[PDB]
Design an enzyme around this catalytic site. Structure first.
Site, short mmCIF file in Angstrom:
data_model
loop_
_atom_site.label_atom_id
_atom_site.label_comp_id
_atom_site.label_asym_id
_atom_site.label_seq_id
_atom_site.Cartn_x
_atom_site.Cartn_y
_atom_site.Cartn_z
N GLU A 140 -3.87 -1.72 2.89
CA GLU A 140 -2.96 -1.19 3.90
C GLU A 140 -2.87 0.34 3.89
O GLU A 140 -1.82 0.90 3.56
CB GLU A 140 -1.55 -1.80 3.73
CG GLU A 140 -1.58 -3.34 3.82
CD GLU A 140 -0.21 -3.98 4.07
OE1 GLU A 140 0.83 -3.32 3.89
OE2 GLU A 140 -0.18 -5.17 4.44
N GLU A 168 -3.71 -11.22 3.51
CA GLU A 168 -2.27 -11.43 3.39
C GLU A 168 -1.70 -12.06 4.66
O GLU A 168 -2.01 -11.62 5.77
CB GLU A 168 -1.52 -10.12 3.15
CG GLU A 168 -1.69 -9.57 1.77
CD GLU A 168 -0.88 -8.31 1.54
OE1 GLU A 168 0.16 -8.13 2.22
OE2 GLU A 168 -1.29 -7.52 0.67
#
Length: 445
Positions: A165, A352
């Site tokens: 991320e 995720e």
């Protein structure tokens, strides 16, 4: 309605080092920026920190037994950089390096492939002291660290994520100031985002050069933002709203360029990434797969007062999780299509996906049926995506355990396994038993 996943589809769960490990000042581990940040007054809800967390540094065998019962094919975890290099560089901390050797070997012993995230936000505080990701020496320090870890594990770890991320590491951490190290400066965040892509490409080129076995990618998070109307201003607002996650971090990797509509918008707001010669060629290394982190989406409407990107995100009727995020499984299907259409048939892992539901233990049971429904809905979107031709190879539920959820602390639970953070007792939730059945059967309704 029956939903069936393919026979070769890989099932996993995911964690991150600082979120579960604890033992923050044991066996030679140096401080990370998240140690510093979570001990700073007012930065983390309830003053929580990751000093103990789930104590998975010690209890890693109890956690591995949880995963063998669950039946997953792959376990996504991260390595604490300041546990290997307490100062970010120089001398290896032997106890930290042997911990991950004991972990990975016990994982493989129990029949679970490792997927390793090299950087999941715990930058050594020693490197933040010299400017952190703003300092191109820290980029080089990441390559040297990744290179050490590549050689150290070339036999055992065959799936690798460089940066988890980058949007959070850069903008959420250095423009909004909500994540460590907590700065509020757009130019700094814009430049840090470029440095993370550079660090990724250099780690990839190192992986190739050294002929490490296996495959490597990175793990951006993305959202779907549906235009409020066909009006051009709404179309552009959503283009920007998604472009800060997708085009900004995918175009340099896949097309060797930053998107011009984002560059122009940033420029009008006083920020230009500091790109040095050879940077773009180094960023655009070929990768084997992309890890997609997806949680949420919305409808976007142009609004000149709606933040930097001037897009108002609207809940037009979605349920929300206990952390307040829209549940938008159709957006998941649409965003994977967007990515496939713009960047090709690259393999995709969903590295995720999960939901915050703060359900408690009652009579030794956790009835987290909201979480089961969330997982059903997003696995359905994945089945639809595969049928539409998106090259999805597997799914990692976030997370195995309730854990330290960054600026929210321990109050926002994402786990399949409940954690009493006072006693560190584990309690399998209903979603654990559901996921176990689904992983084995490979279908649900």
């Amino acid at each position: 309605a029956i939903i069936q996943l393919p026979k070769d589809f890989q099932w996993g769960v995911a964690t991150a080092a600082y979120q579960i490990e604890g033992a923050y000042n044991e066996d030679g581990r140096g401080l990370s920026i998240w140690d510093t940040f979570s001990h700073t007054p007012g930065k983390v809800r309830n003053g929580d920190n990751g000093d103990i967390a789930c104590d998975s540094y010690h209890r890693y065998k109890e956690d591995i037994k949880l995963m063998k019962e669950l039946g997953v094919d792959i376990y996504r975890f991260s390595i604490s950089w300041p546990r290997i290099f307490p100062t970010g560089r120089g001398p290896v901390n032997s106890k930290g390096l042997e911990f991950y050797h004991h972990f990975v070997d016990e994982l493989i012993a129990n029949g679970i492939e490792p997927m390793c995230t090299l950087y999941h936000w715990d930058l050594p505080q020693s490197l933040q002291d010299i400017g952190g990701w703003a300092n191109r020496e820290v980029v080089e320090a990441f390559v040297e660290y990744s290179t050490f870890i590549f050689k150290e594990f070339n036999g055992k770890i065959k799936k690798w994520i460089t940066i988890n991320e980058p949007w959070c590491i850069s903008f959420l951490s250095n423009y909004e100031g909500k994540h460590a190290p907590g700065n509020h400066n757009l130019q700094l965040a814009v430049t840090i985002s470029h440095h993370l892509l550079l660090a990724h490409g250099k780690a990839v080129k190192a992986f190739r050069n050294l002929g490490i076995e296996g495959e490597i990618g990175y793990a951006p998070n993305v959202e779907w933002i549906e235009p409020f109307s066909s009006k051009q201003e709404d179309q552009d607002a959503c283009h920007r709203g998604m472009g800060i996650f997708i085009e900004w971090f995918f175009d340099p990797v896949f097309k060797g360029k930053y998107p011009d509509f984002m560059l122009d918008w940033f420029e009008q707001n006083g920020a230009v990434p500091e790109i040095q010669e050879g940077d773009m060629q180094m960023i655009s290394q070929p990768i084997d797969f992309v890890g997609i982190n997806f949680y949420t989406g919305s409808v976007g409407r142009y609004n000149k007062e709606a933040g930097l990107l001037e897009v108002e995100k609207i809940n037009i009727g979605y349920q929300t999780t206990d952390i307040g995020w829209n549940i938008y499984p159709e957006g998941f299907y649409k965003v994977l299509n967007k990515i496939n259409n713009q960047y090709g048939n690259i393999p995709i892992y969903i590295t995720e996906n999960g939901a915050c539901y703060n359900d408690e233990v009652i009579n030794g049971r956790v009835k987290d049926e909201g979480r089961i429904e969330y997982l059903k809905q997003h696995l359905t979107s994945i089945r639809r995506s595969i049928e539409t031709g998106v090259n999805i190879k597997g799914y990692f539920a976030w997370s195995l355990l309730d854990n330290f959820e960054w600026a929210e602390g321990y109050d926002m639970r994402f786990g399949l396994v409940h954690i009493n953070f006072h006693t560190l007792e584990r309690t399998k939730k209903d979603s654990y038993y559901w996921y176990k059945k689904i992983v084995r059967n490979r279908w649900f309704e």
